[PDB]
Ligand binder design. Structure first.
Ligand SMILES: CCN(CC)C(=O)c1ccc(N)cc1
Ligand SMILES: CCN(CC)C(=O)c1ccc(N)cc1
Ligand SMILES: CCN(CC)C(=O)c1ccc(N)cc1
Ligand SMILES: CCN(CC)C(=O)c1ccc(N)cc1
Ligand SMILES: CCN(CC)C(=O)c1ccc(N)cc1
Ligand SMILES: CCN(CC)C(=O)c1ccc(N)cc1
Ligand SMILES: CCN(CC)C(=O)c1ccc(N)cc1
Ligand SMILES: CCN(CC)C(=O)c1ccc(N)cc1
Lengths: 269, 268
């Protein structure tokens, strides 16, 4: 991997592994989400920010401030097959004092064609109080010299899916998977549940017949609260719709506290 | 990755990823086990066998025969840090008509030092009846031209840890993690639970204080039965001692054994 010529974006190639693929012998969306996080982390390293997933400056570290994901939105046109080489380009942009955005473009390395795209919204939070805060000029200025100054969007479209508000699923859910719990493999280096595990949990309540006959085209996921030590999660799904659409809700199995909400769009194979 | 000069082994380099590391910022043993499976699969591919994890010939495919893991044994001297490049060499060997063995050697690409080693026992089974079978001459001959003819062992010593019999843990277990269940990410391309998921489940019942103060040095795991559709697993652990543990995975309901194993940990 390397920063590009102008130093405002980062590119890295990956060869799809045997254990990274599903029943069609192509990469799962969780494998894609993991590669997006990996290239994001290598971009942060390439310019001197923290490499713990929080991409902080020394200024944020003394204030105990971190960046956290508020939303992930992925659209895949073609999942890469096992053994295929995928090239991913990523870049970041400030969105005033609200937060930051990281975008990605996925390409087939052999054809050069765009096979997927993704975008994410990040907010600044105190790591101890968990209180959100607006971005100060000092923090914004530190990041601005590492971002394009003119807008560069993976999702330029007028009223695109990545910015739509997601409603709260109402009981009874059509489908559910109960009592989901993380194991050590689901944790990151900071002992926090990896953001990709929540994508897996959302997908667990999609019936197997949909997965066997359809391909996931778009997923939008809001992150509202973390799954903490000893927490157990229920995954709820209701059909909202050759295309099938679903509304998703992850909540704590006991008191029903919301942890995530999302939507998925699937195309018939 | 590529076959080596003599064509009887395969080498491949991997750069440790951000999501592949634990609290010490070094690769977990499940990341190591996944890389061992990946290099095994690329070796099978390089010589024309199936690439579904079963490494079959056309002869085995017409008979509905597959190779399955009976035991995995891994010894790690140093876990690679995030960003480090690790080189893994692998080869296989027939063990008469009982089955086959795959061995691996892990090295730090910069220093050339051996940082780990692993070995595994595989048996031939009919994929439908699940009945084990001895290896016929026809199948053995197909594999022999792809294996070293003189013994080459990652664990050469007579009576080493990789060959020891593992006892069955007796209730009550000292520690347990109950109701473990796979999700789609735990499945392979054939919709079977990945062998590495069982390593993760075994480790779940080790108390967090051991993991925080020790490093896993050796793991030996027997595979007795698969976790099938809608199965739920209990992970049981008892200290037998460095710290040593005895492990048992069994189905949550009737208590049917699926795996047994042992782990050896060194104080940090
Ligand atoms: C979205 C979080 N964040 C810091 C703002 C980053 O990942 C980041 C990384 C490299 C870079 N040049 C600029 C930003
Ligand atoms: C509805 C609140 N919310 C997400 C927490 C936002 O408006 C938001 C917008 C841009 C961004 N980079 C980060 C966050
Ligand atoms: C207006 C769309 N939008 C912000 C992108 C949201 O509703 C949103 C709210 C909370 C959250 N964690 C993530 C997203
Ligand atoms: C006991 C299972 N387990 C994962 C190891 C957890 O409950 C757990 C959840 C969140 C977290 N940050 C850390 C740990
Ligand atoms: C242990 C299963 N098995 C087939 C015997 C293999 O993985 C195998 C792969 C490549 C090779 N040259 C020889 C053997
Ligand atoms: C005790 C039975 N058993 C394991 C099933 C074996 O003797 C065994 C030995 C070598 C080998 N490649 C495969 C199997
Ligand atoms: C000491 C002999 N030996 C094989 C090495 C075993 O006890 C053995 C038995 C069953 C199994 N699935 C794996 C291993
Ligand atoms: C419903 C959860 N789940 C994983 C998708 C399973 O019970 C499962 C277990 C083994 C297997 N081969 C296939 C599936």
């Amino acid at each position: 991997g390397s920063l590009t010529e102008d130093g405002l974006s980062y590119k890295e190639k990956f060869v799809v592994r045997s254990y990274e693929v599903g029943s069609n012998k192509t990469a799962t969306v969780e494998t894609i989400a993991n590669l997006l996080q990996e290239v994001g982390c290598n971009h942060a390293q390439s310019v001197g920010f923290s490499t713990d997933g929080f991409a902080t400056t020394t200024t944020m570290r003394k204030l105990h401030l971190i960046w956290v994901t508020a939303r992930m939105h992925i659209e895949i046109y073609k999942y890469p097959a096992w053994g295929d080489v995928v090239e991913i380009e990523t870049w970041c942009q400030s969105e005033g004092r609200i937060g930051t955005r990281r975008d990605w473009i996925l390409k087939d390395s052999v054809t050069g064609e765009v096979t997927g795209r993704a975008t994410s919204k990040w907010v600044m939070m105190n790591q101890d109080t968990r209180r959100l805060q607006k971005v100060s000029d000092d923090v914004r200025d530190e990041y601005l010299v590492f971002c394009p100054q003119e807008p560069r969007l993976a999702f330029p479209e007028e009223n695109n899916r990545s910015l739509k508000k997601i409603p709260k699923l109402e009981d009874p859910a059509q489908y559910s998977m109960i009592g989901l719990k993380p194991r050590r493999a689901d944790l990151d280096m900071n002992q926090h549940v990896n953001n990709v595990t929540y994508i897996g949990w959302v997908l667990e309540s999609i019936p197997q017949e949909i997965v066997d006959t359809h391909e996931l085209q778009v997923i939008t996921l809001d992150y509202r609260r973390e799954c903490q030590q000893d927490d157990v999660v229920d995954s709820l799904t209701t059909t909202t719709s050759n295309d099938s659409q679903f509304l998703h809700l992850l909540r704590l199995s006991g008191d029903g506290q919301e942890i995530n909400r999302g939507t998925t769009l699937w195309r018939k194979k």
